[PDB]
Design a protein around this ligand. Structure first.
Ligand code: ZX8
Ligand code: ZX8
Ligand code: ZX8
Ligand code: ZX8
Lengths: 441, 441, 441, 441
């Protein structure tokens, strides 16, 4: 058993399944999906924080944006819905009329994901399961249905792991003033003992009803409730040792860390297990304002996954469904594009470990990443070189044998000084899809 | 912005408006105003604390007195209302049938007050605004009206500042045993986490609905909720930098300190901004038992104001209205008397600063106080000397010019040793109303 | 009395003498003054923190730079003193053979300064007084003299206030590893109970031996010792009420805040008393490598003081003496020039208060700053306009009388729209030294 | 960088070199080695704690035993050294006259160990290095030599990793009363701030002087000093990322856990890196009273290491040298025998990982342990079966190829039900030394 103390809970490390899974699907879905609107300003870490909340690209932040008068959201809202239309009202419009959890699960499985994590409660406080601690939930309003439970059953039937996201650090049902600047986050929070009990009871409830594979908390945990996590974590691990928690609780324990868009993104091997998350575009919740110009292309998604994995991370790619429960076409295509690439190259991703180094590049500027499976080293190019002669800078191999991954064809190579030279027959180079992949042994 | 930490909140000092205002009106009004009864025993600080709670002169302490069997209040109550008449019942009798907030505001403006602060919730827990955290309030019971909101609108329309009083440290809706001795205050308190959240939510609510100019807490703050004040104060000052808080929270921060009747009353310049409070009589809530023998006379009120101001303080004079919302005649006359004196002498009060010393006296025992406005020094006598020859002890001036304030007539003076001599023409002496006032330059 | 708790200590505010003084002299003098060498890289706030400690422009950080091998300092040291010359050895070379405290005091008085603050102990832990808590001090080594005491007597003899600088946060006699990045400061500190007691005892000793007018701590106070400050401050204020402390202790109390070069420099009135500090060049300690190109010119110093004062601050200008006790001519000539402008314009500086706004500018960009003395408003131009017709943007006056400060000559003016037009005869413009100064009433 | 907080420190996990090393040598050497005497009562975990301290088998607890009058130790001491011979006096007899560190290092290398950890300071508080914080150390007394440093140089010269053992929890130089029952440990400890600083300073000094590969604390860390460990660990890891610390500090962080004789010995795979420690006999310090009957035989040592390694642990085997610096032949011959088996079977130990299960057994009870190297699974028999037909209970293989480890000879096998049958020709069985080793692929 795990005891309720940080020294004991440290005994639990990231489970194997999670380390080997490499790719998961995040799902931000709630009543904010109904208006599904945000100004696609840019990526977190690139937009100046003094403007960020006033032109928030996270459509799931709609309510906070609505609370800032004369913010693009306020104007959009007043003209589309009217001023006598409270944000809460969207809970009744959220009907998930076309939702089919098995179709979602089929899709995430085809895309190559091995786990799925929906938002059980985001910052607006709306709950997607029939919780008994609030009536502001999907069973009582809108969908008239236990979205979390139903999705978990479908995901698990498809053979994928199932986790839960819970906004522990923020709940706008307990505050009135919006977040205008990053500094505001230091005092505009529920702040009460009552809220801390609520959060604790809600996560314990999720654990008892669905025994998730991952407890993904966001925005930190209520200061008054931090001590509670020793008990919660021990309770959780003792019922599910292969369970896992992220690092957004603000306490000593975590099984894996996180990075969001540019924030805390590592440039080289970090030394611990971590997970990258971002939307296919610039938002997590659905944004009808985004076009393909704001989204990553299938090629960019593949290069992102490879970069992340060579660095020991897992990619948790977010999908932003519509209020009716359908997944926009732009998103579905990119999920599929990635699933296709993974069907061909998956063996150099799933189940791999990091190598001595994560990165390299060809004399001509083509970026390279490495992954490993025992004695096999995968050399993954972020693109496909034009010429048959490939010069990798600052790299020497002691393998003696280097094959072209898809075909398995042995290739010719030699360490020329501080570099490594390989000849890749154009026929092979033409077989690869987005990345030229080599395997050294 | 202010950050939620004591070191940062210290950056906020008492606002100018408050320091210059000098005189404000306190209003203790609640359901205790209906029975409006107390034994007028004496002034706080003069009555032995071993008898005080058994013969409490604070009529607003009626419920606590009622809970002590065979206390004058219990007997009075049983004979007037009966034993089957719970204190709470007075919430239904509290109808404010004749209340006219604009008339209150007109009156406080004529009296010379620059700010007004009503009890939003006193020790009995009854709330004078439509709070959503309890049904024991003025919108649901008795007046059927938002007394706080309505008074704030009237006060502000009259051009005066508006603050709120909130009994944070005591709420008898959460306790059953009465306070019999001062020691009891150390354990007979709500004491629960629930109460601490309640208090926090109620003051945050007052801030969001009325954005008061002063948060006047009383009886300390729930120990469990003290840390909450860092967030509350930062939240408040960031929405209203000219807002202010008193010193009854029991935490590191405060903008001005307080003194009640004789308690913590300074004898000389204190070194920080402070405010004196007391009732026109011996109680804060209306007491039909007080006669003019228990009240300060207009002259005493003026001398009190001057003493307080020369010492850097503000006077917060309490008015105890009746259950029907009218202000007793004894009180209205004294408010008016003071307003008259302030109309004539206001320029030596509002906007003044303390001088090198607060006090002095004439060879014959007439007390004197000083205030200042740059190079002008006001010399205010607590009374009007009979003889034209005035000898002030232990004072020498380097002004060269001393005028008689009301008329502006230059006077004859000279430093005779360790004293200062001035000749005040009887004609002038007869022009003054309660205080002979001189101005040195 | 002041009590040992933050709520009581809050009662003490910045003493009047300090608020009115406006200009003081900082003195960073120690054994680092002997090598007196640094790479004059740039101003704090403008140099990237990734390079700063490696090319530190603060000569007083010589020891820390010396511990980073292959730092310019390390190279310089090895060629100049040798690889076997430990930093501590500089205490034997620090002889202050040509030191004359009354000569320093007279120069600071002539320079227009009202208070002086020497480094009693900087980060290297060497003490400039005969402390009984360490033998690494100026009585036992180097000068064989109590430098703090002898300087304190001299400064006071000259009629100036005397404060003490103490490095509470860092003491390299308790660490071995150098600071290479800002992050290192979070763990490379003495850290022991022993050190917290040491710092408490030494500041207590400074208070006892010299009862300074200012306790200027630097680098934070040892976490373990933070609660001691309640007792230290009450002890101090009870012995010396007109005493004062800065804001670098990391506890709730402080009497004035500070800004260093660009760091925390206010853009407008801040709302509390503060003080700006910087060296005449880029270092606080004497740097033989700085030349006039690294120093502020007299003109710039004047503009600095004016800007700081119009925003309610005091300027604490640093002088870096040599190991022999002399003050370099470059620094001396700048002090004397500033003193000259102050002898001429002192009245628009000393004893002033902030006005409604600190700033304005002329139609052709000449910056303007304001100060006040009751009804008299001083208009200071940062430079002397060439033409006689002056147009001040966004300013209206309601004084009816504007004079030329130096001569007293009444000048012609009028409010022309959102601007203020004034005519200043070239004969006056020609009398002003570095600043055109106007006086409106 | 690692930051000084538990959440950041969590990022550091057991270094690869340690996980792969599998075997290290502990060395308990001090002035207690001079009397070198204890009652060899039994193994920790098997001796009732009501008797233990009174008949302590740990020779290194001589001083504590000596303070309990009428303890076998007290008797022995009085007859051997005399009632007037204080324990501290043993520091003058501790001369290590025949010590040769390179000879120890070569023996540890030849024994198959990859790291060495000597007691820099045991419970008696005597320090085996020239610490500047106490004169009770080996440079000032006894050997007049820095034993930790000289041993560190030698061990490293031999190519092995060097760690340090430090008694943080107990120091008998700070107590006078002996430990008689486990309960006494809860209050007979140094207990002062002074001691918490002392321990922090000495471990910091060990890190600075020798930058050890392992910080192996014992007996917990002083409560008052626990928060210092955040800073100590970050300081340490930032200087030496491949460094490591054990789990005996009583704080949230640790890189590997420990087990001592029977205490905390895992029965199956535990889920985290750990290390088993015990003496070759019943004592850590040299006990002249132990004979071969109290010691593990070479065979038992082999079986121990194998059991520990198959369960993911490292074995830290203790050697107890004599006061003169020599290692007793009984211990030396066991180290050499183990080294012989490791030179022969090293490949099935060093650099291995745990498999699905650690354990199995043959039809006639021969215990079996497993280790892995990617696809190669090592099958280690704790003993060599007599017959050629072997039946392994509850094991099935899906390798298709099982070889005899020593020769490489392919062997015949098949899954017979829930069992695995294999034929090993006696000529092979006769080549194995203490263990039959098989290799499945
Ligand atoms: C996944 C996204 N999380 C946002 C909040 N982000 C955080 O609390 C935060 C961001 C972040 C980045 C790196 C490491 C830790 C971090 O914590 C949240 O506001 C968005 O709506 C969305 O749910
Ligand atoms: C204004 C009056 N306050 C009474 C409670 N008084 C206090 O908590 C108290 C009294 C007091 C006096 C000096 C400084 C601080 C102080 O705190 C309260 O019991 C009365 O009913 C009335 O509201
Ligand atoms: C006056 C200088 N102070 C330096 C340390 N600075 C700080 O700790 C710091 C800098 C700073 C700037 C604005 C407000 C607070 C601040 O604290 C110190 O390192 C220099 O050697 C010199 O003594
Ligand atoms: C290696 C030996 N350690 C003894 C102290 N043991 C402990 O504090 C203890 C024993 C123990 C066993 C498993 C996990 C943690 C544990 O802590 C110590 O008293 C002996 O003298 C010797 O140094």
């Amino acid at each position: 058993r795990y005891k309720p103390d940080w020294e004991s809970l440290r005994e639990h490390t990231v489970p194997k399944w999670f380390d080997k899974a490499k790719f998961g699907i995040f799902i931000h879905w709630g009543i904010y999906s109904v208006p599904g609107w945000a100004t696609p300003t840019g990526e977190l870490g690139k937009v100046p924080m003094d403007a960020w909340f006033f032109q928030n690209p996270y459509a799931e932040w709609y309510e906070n944006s609505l609370r800032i008068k004369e913010s693009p959201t306020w104007e959009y809202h007043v003209k589309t819905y009217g001023e006598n239309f409270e944000y809460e009202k969207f809970a009744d419009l959220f009907t998930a009329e076309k939702w089919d959890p098995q179709e979602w699960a089929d899709l995430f499985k085809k895309a190559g994901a091995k786990y799925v994590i929906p938002t059980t409660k985001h910052h607006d406080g709306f709950c997607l399961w029939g919780t008994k601690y609030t009536d502001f939930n999907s069973v009582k309003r809108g969908p008239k249905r236990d979205l979390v439970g139903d999705l978990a059953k479908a995901v698990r039937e498809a053979g994928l792991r199932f986790g839960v996201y819970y906004s522990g650090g923020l709940d706008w049902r307990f505050t009135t003033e919006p977040i205008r600047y990053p500094e505001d986050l230091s005092y505009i929070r529920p702040n009460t003992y009552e809220y801390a009990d609520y959060a604790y009871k809600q996560v314990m409830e999720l654990v008892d009803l669905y025994l998730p594979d991952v407890l993904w908390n966001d925005m930190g945990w209520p200061e008054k409730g931090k001590e509670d996590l020793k008990y919660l974590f021990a309770y959780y691990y003792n019922k599910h040792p292969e369970g896992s928690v992220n690092d957004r609780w603000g306490v000593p324990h975590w099984d894996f860390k996180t990075a969001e868009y540019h924030v805390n993104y590592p440039g080289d091997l970090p030394g611990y297990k971590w997970e990258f998350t971002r939307g296919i575009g610039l938002s997590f919740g659905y944004n009808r304002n985004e076009g393909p110009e704001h989204m990553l292309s299938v090629e960019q998604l593949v290069y992102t996954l490879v970069d992340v994995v060579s660095k020991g991370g897992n990619l948790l790619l977010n999908v932003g469904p519509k209020g009716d429960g359908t997944i926009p076409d732009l998103q579905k295509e990119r999920l599929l594009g990635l699933g296709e690439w993974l069907r061909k190259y998956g063996d150099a991703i799933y189940g791999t470990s990091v190598w001595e180094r994560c990165c390299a590049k060809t004399e001509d500027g083509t970026e390279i990443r490495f992954t490993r499976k025992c004695n096999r080293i995968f050399v993954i190019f972020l693109g496909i070189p034009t010429g048959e002669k490939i010069v990798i800078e600052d790299l020497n191999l002691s393998a003696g044998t280097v094959r072209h991954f898809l075909t398995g064809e042995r290739l010719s190579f030699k360490n020329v000084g501080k570099n490594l030279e390989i000849t890749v027959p154009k026929k092979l180079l033409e077989t690869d899809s987005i990345t030229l992949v080599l395997e050294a042994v």
